[model samples]
Target: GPNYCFAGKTSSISDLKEVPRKNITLIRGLGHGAFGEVYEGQVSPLQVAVKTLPEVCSEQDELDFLMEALIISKFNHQNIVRCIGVSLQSLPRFILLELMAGGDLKSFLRETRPRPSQPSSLAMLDLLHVARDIACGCQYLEENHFIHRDIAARNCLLTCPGPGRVAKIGDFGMARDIYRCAMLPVKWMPPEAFEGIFTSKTDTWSFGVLLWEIFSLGYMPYPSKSNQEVLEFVTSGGRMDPPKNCPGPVYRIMTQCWQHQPEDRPNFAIILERIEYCTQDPDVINTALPIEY
Candidate 1:
């Protein structure tokens, strides 16, 4: 846990001076892309994380996304990462969010590769925990009329220590309200996303891919194939089998989430309940699914 003092700071897109240095310490160099480099920072001793699109980001949509994330920052839940504050005065912009010390579930699984199978042995239990936490967070968002556009292991940030790892959904860079059109990134993107379809259920489709990532422990969602190839597979009613180590129940859930017809996808609310049940009883495998291997 980090020591933090609640203090309000205000700044603009061109000059963010109102944010106090003592309360928020900034560190440079982290994630990068077409936008820019995300700087690491600490919102007090307890909250250490990165800020994306400080005031000078090249695109306006990027800024809009940050604003959307800021809007949902007030949704306080154990599964949702805390959105401390934002500093827009700087050229790019700044979203002071809770730092996830555990990195992401994707990278965490890659820690013991070589055999690859090693991760599978521990995947079911690990994924179940992660799913439970993500569901809890998503449930909170859904209740608030907010839809997490992207939900994957890479976006899941873990701030808690071991045993009961406190995992929260991070990266609101792709989030939107229930009424907004869905804009999905390639890879784990749902089918409807390609047809200009954006709905709360579309998020559920993405969640299915996320579940697959967690169950496989960082492995590719549909194998190490090219984008075109994966798309073909997804559109052709093809599905990848879970890693040998992943429990059958989880794979079932992933399959349900990955259904080709967007309407066929299960509601996240129902999914959350199922995840909770799996957490409480390991033997309760979801055999009702006929996931085409």
Candidate 2:
């Protein structure tokens, strides 16, 4: 049975797991949700990012969440974030992961930009590199039968160095293990996803939207609309057209992913190959550089 002994509203700090006593020094809090607060912690010599769930959450959800993180960590890939360990012995469950030093791709780009946000200034080569890196991570996740429902740049973290510098696909909090179909309401979830249908294909749909976000350099997917309005708009055939400056071929891929039919979307294997072919060698694909508006 799951215990909510450490839920924030009902329990004191002492009732909570002694994080420091457990050798995970709480550096600072990061984000919070229906589950719990995320924190930056130091476990021995390695700095780890930790997500602690409130004891009040359903034991099943907590256990499933922890298990998903464990499954994700077992995957050893250069592009994905590495999970350090899980703590079930403590009152509130906690999942530890390696901290991304350079923060996420969206914020990192903003900080490093020199006023002009043109992709040309950043160079086509650099732009494609980031896409390829993301594809590599998605490919790995799909291969393992896991669906990362959330794939936006906001949830993706990048390490130091430069673009295509190790990107970690994160935020498994919204993740649902896809072995058997499950119906969990998810905001921004694809239409197929809303009907209790969960599959790698639905994940593919989300990835397409994410690609658009990266292409726009963090621009809002639909301007001047409430979240519900955006969802309705997309479901009603209103689609994201790549920005005028975006390359045509890239726009095509994005559209394929956003198609109404789930089966119509390309799986990660095909998506990976195509993205690699075009982005890996711009000369071979002859992908045009983003046009300056």
Candidate 3:
């Protein structure tokens, strides 16, 4: 029998036989993070993003990579990145993905801020739309019993430029099956997450921090506070204040996401409802102006 299967398809280290390493060529470096480096690559006729891990250091590391691949391969949502497959024929294992030319949501917000040479701001409605996209992706994950422990701006990617661009959730290395616990992003973590408690509820908590990042033009959450201090701050019922131009409805949704009790936090479906309501105003949807530095 094959080593493993997901989404009705069989896969194994040997599956790479059909996807030869010779068929892919690196284009240029894209970015790097905790897990590994990503590069722009060409897989024959298709341009792709290739993520490579360090040479296999242990059996556990290989297992982790496979698990990550398995989790991402099964996801087929417009608001989530698509996984092409893995390269396990030799050392320096890698995963191939569809290229997101618009970089990531984190840098997109930062770069688009009201620059003196070309000043403009993201409309509130556009931000809500992005939020809705992420919520929909998370909602899909919840329906599948997956918990994306890390749901921040850095992990949300853009498909194109402009306010109309599509945002997709990515960076699945930190995700897990619901209820399983692992180390999580501290500033984005819920109190329960610190104790190895994870679920859709904890993911909701992190989503709130992401909303804060969007409205604040990519400002770091809990500015000037250490990770420990951020945890204590959340434990003390402290939350980020609304951005200077944040709409009342958006702020309210953020509060709902930060409910102290995990059960009290709104799930992705409920959060999507709030965003739908927030976007009902045509005036708000059409409002566009220079970024307010």
Candidate 4:
């Protein structure tokens, strides 16, 4: 069970199903990861992205890369990026992932600054909808006993730009090593996580922060606090105030996630239901909280 096969050559990746090189077309580079280069490419009538391995890499590099394809192949959801196939049978082996044209949610929100003169392009209902999309995926993960560990706007992607944009989760298991020795997203992490504790509830805490990123037009939470100071502030009963123009009900939802006790934070499923309820009721989702009150 789950046996990997690597034959003949030392560099060949194990067990991944391959796509013919002709069927795959590399259009341009999307971005660089610690593992290798990601490219926007085409396969038949569809456009896709693939993480291509370099000419020379360590055995550990290939192992981790191929392993990611194995795990993500189990994912099936509209709100989570899917790995359609992997091509390691050929040189310059790659893992094919579905492309999201709208890019990451952070820059998307950052560019659309909300002000009194010009409101953000995404309405409150739209923000609620994006949150719902993320929660929907996270709920799926929770049901499967998966922990994203890294859940933030930067790690989230969009289907397309402007209104009706769909947000999806990504960048969790793909490059596992980079995160090991580097700084984690302490700002989005829960208080308990500082003690090396993590569970679905910790993700719930990050989900609340992601919602603030949406409402705050992509501003960083606890703006001035350093990573070391984050746990101190959180333990001292400090939480970010409601983002400017954030609705009362939405603020309450965020507060529900920031509860000091892990059990106090609502699970993703409950958060999903809460967001669905809020979205369906304009009385809750439409009214923006007054600023400087």
In candidate 3, what are the lDDT values of residues 1-293, reduced to their tens digit? 22544445665555532257888888999878754579999886988898887783777666767666666777889899988877866458878887888888999888877665776456676688888888899898887767777899999888877757888997876753331123447999888776677788988999999999887778899889988888899999998888767777788888999999999999888999988988997755655534554
State which candidate has the highest TM-score.
3
Using lDDT, give the best candidate's number: 3
- Tens digit per residue, CA lDDT, model 4, 87-143: 877879878888988888888877656555555455677778889999999998787
Name the better of 1 and 4 by TM-score: 4
lDDT of 2 by residue, 1-293 (tens): 22221112222222322334366666888777433467888885778888776788886666665555545455678788787776656767677777877777777554543333644445545555676777788887788666777777767777764544676676565663432123242324577654667688877777787777666666656667767776687778888768536677677778888878888889888877777766755553454444434
List of clashing residue pairs for candidate 2:
4-55
Each prediction's total of clashing residue pairs, residues at least 3 apart in sequence or on different chains, is: 15, 1, 0, 0
Q: In candidate 2, where is summed lDDT lowest over 10 consecutive residues?
A: 4-13
lDDT at 135, model 2: 77
Can you rank all candidates by lDDT, best first? Answer: 3, 4, 2, 1
Q: Residue 194 deviation, candidate 4, in Å?
A: 1.7
> Which candidate, 1 or 2, has the higher TM-score?
1
Instruction: Give RMSD (Å) of candidate 3 vs. truth.
Output: 3.1
Cα error of candidate 2 at position 20, Å: 10
Using TM-score as the measure, what is the rank order of every candidate, best first? Answer: 3, 4, 1, 2
Candidate 4, which segments miss by more than 4 Å at Cα? 1-15, 33-36, 115-120, 174-182, 288-293
lDDT per model, in order? 0.62, 0.65, 0.79, 0.78
lDDT of candidate 2 at residue 268, scale 0 to 100: 81
